[PDB]
Design a protein around this ligand. Sequence first.
Ligand SMILES: *[C@](O)(C(=O)NCCc1ccccc1)[C@H](C[C@@H]1CCNC1=O)NC(=O)[C@@H]1CCCN1C(=O)OCc1ccccc1
Ligand SMILES: *[C@](O)(C(=O)NCCc1ccccc1)[C@H](C[C@@H]1CCNC1=O)NC(=O)[C@@H]1CCCN1C(=O)OCc1ccccc1
Ligand SMILES: [Cl-]
Ligand SMILES: [Cl-]
Ligand code: NA
Lengths: 305, 306
Amino acid sequence: SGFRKMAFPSGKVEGCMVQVTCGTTTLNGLWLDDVVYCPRHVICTSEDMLNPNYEDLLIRKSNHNFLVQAGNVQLRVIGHSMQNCVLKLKVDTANPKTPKYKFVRIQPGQTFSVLACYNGSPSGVYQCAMRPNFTIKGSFLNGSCGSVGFNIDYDCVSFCYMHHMELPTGVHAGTDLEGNFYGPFVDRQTAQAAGTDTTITVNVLAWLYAAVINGDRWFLNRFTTTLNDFNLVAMKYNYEPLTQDHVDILGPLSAQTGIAVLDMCASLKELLQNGMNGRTILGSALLEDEFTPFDVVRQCSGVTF
Amino acid sequence: SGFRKMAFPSGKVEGCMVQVTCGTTTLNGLWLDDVVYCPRHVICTSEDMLNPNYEDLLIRKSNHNFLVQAGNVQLRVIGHSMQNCVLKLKVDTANPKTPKYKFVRIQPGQTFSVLACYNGSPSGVYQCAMRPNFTIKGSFLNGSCGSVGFNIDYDCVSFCYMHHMELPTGVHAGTDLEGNFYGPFVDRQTAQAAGTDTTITVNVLAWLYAAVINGDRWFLNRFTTTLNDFNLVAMKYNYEPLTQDHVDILGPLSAQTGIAVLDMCASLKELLQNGMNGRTILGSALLEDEFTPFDVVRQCSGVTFQ
Ligand SMILES: *[C@](O)(C(=O)NCCc1ccccc1)[C@H](C[C@@H]1CCNC1=O)NC(=O)[C@@H]1CCCN1C(=O)OCc1ccccc1
Ligand SMILES: *[C@](O)(C(=O)NCCc1ccccc1)[C@H](C[C@@H]1CCNC1=O)NC(=O)[C@@H]1CCCN1C(=O)OCc1ccccc1
Ligand SMILES: [Cl-]
Ligand SMILES: [Cl-]
Ligand code: NA
């Protein structure tokens, strides 16, 4: 028993991290097969970072302008191209540690593991969720750009995030591995506000199920409700709407606990209206919303990679 | 910016995890060089778990009674020895993925990363702290025994924990890699229970410093305290005593923020008195005690956001 914020084992990703330098700029790259992926703003100076013409800055560059370092070995760049906000550096050597992988784009509410890296060296791993406002609450310092987020399924790494930005409130923004930003953000040094965030309702429900599985039951009650009535409460408390799909997705946890979703929705409804009355749930005084239904089942069933 | 429960990258430990089977019993082992370390209760049967005589159980085993599997490769056991509550199986192959490593026994309050494993395969990684009562608040299911805890400061893996038990309150107990338990626990199914736990005061203060570094000062106040007056108050909330060693360890964080340690103690005293009044600190509505001073310096910027 027990319930912890748990990240995927990071070893398959660690073997892919490299250092990329262009001029005085150094950040991290992802080395898969014979291509290194990194943020396109590696080609920028600070003057460029206000209003960068990435089109013109890249046609000025050549292969020799890029230094790629894998551990203590230099990788020779033999081609370069841009895809959206990502730079693709073709190198002369295929990464012998390349895992089975695919590039995926995740939806708000979904979670992933971040391997925070500096100068091509992994530093730490933690679990994040894509917020409804398309930011992530990460932990990133200067030099972390190019760090990636991922999920693992059996032996297959699904890369979903590359780090690019920190916003004025200290939350973070990035792209998928095809260089498309999550959220209404652009890669330049301008003030860009994260939109007002909301709470991920289906994940709060998933975490309440985890609490029941772990013996925390004080919030269960005799009442049930309907989607419509609950969604009016959700909107009142800046929670995301709950859809029938979310109810279906909570099936496995509803099957494991023998508690109906609209049953649990009535519990969450009262928690929002009355608070916790000085009690905690799974060691938290807040309603936690960065565990997905899949995250709960995987952790409570010991799934292995 | 940001502040997260941050584990070490687990790859160096993943390459050491194997499956150990004896009889119908399977758990995890740690393969370093030509030795596989695992909990000695892998040799137990249903009856033997209340008062196992491990010396008598082990002398009856042959090397071929131990099946060690590294992924898809069977490792041949060529010898075995028991050290305290750990079994050491000599194998005929040295692990080519063995990292630079050492064994360290940690003190209560220290943190480490746990690589939770089942059947020799990693499931996930998370941060833990050794509680003052020598338990850890883990996430462990049947089959997780032999999973290990570690730090990797400066590219050297320091193994500090091997998982052996879940106690009736749902918390967890185990050994160092020399097989000595943390706390008063034993690898028997006889009634055991953890002592009353307490909050790791020096870690809470470290985390309040992290909050200041990241730009939050709402909880500070104009007062100070003596060390002894602080401990008289904090112990009324089941906080561990704060020692001069702890004050010294907090020095670098005090220097970076300009907040004297005993002035931060005065803030904590008021936070215990008042609660947070609807506010949060670094995203939490409770006072967090599983970040050490070292952890905060590891993760936070060296430049305070004034
Ligand atoms: C990230 O770009 C990085 O790690 N940079 C490494 C070194 C470097 C690369 C390119 C150019 C110069 C230097 C960095 C990571 C941030 C910094 C702090 N925490 C993080 O997560 N991200 C950025 O600097 C990005 C690049 C485009 C602009 N930007 C950014 O964060 O803008 C926010 C902003 C800052 C100041 C003023 C206005 C907006
Ligand atoms: C751990 O031993 C394990 O993973 N076992 C897997 C299969 C197996 C191996 C060897 C022998 C038998 C079976 C297991 C992990 C626990 C279970 C649930 N969560 C966990 O972390 N730990 C145990 O079962 C240990 C072994 C010695 C006794 N024990 C235990 O947990 O007993 C609990 C207890 C009962 C009464 C009083 C005090 C403690
Ligand atoms: Cl220690
Ligand atoms: Cl109070
Ligand atoms: Na109900």
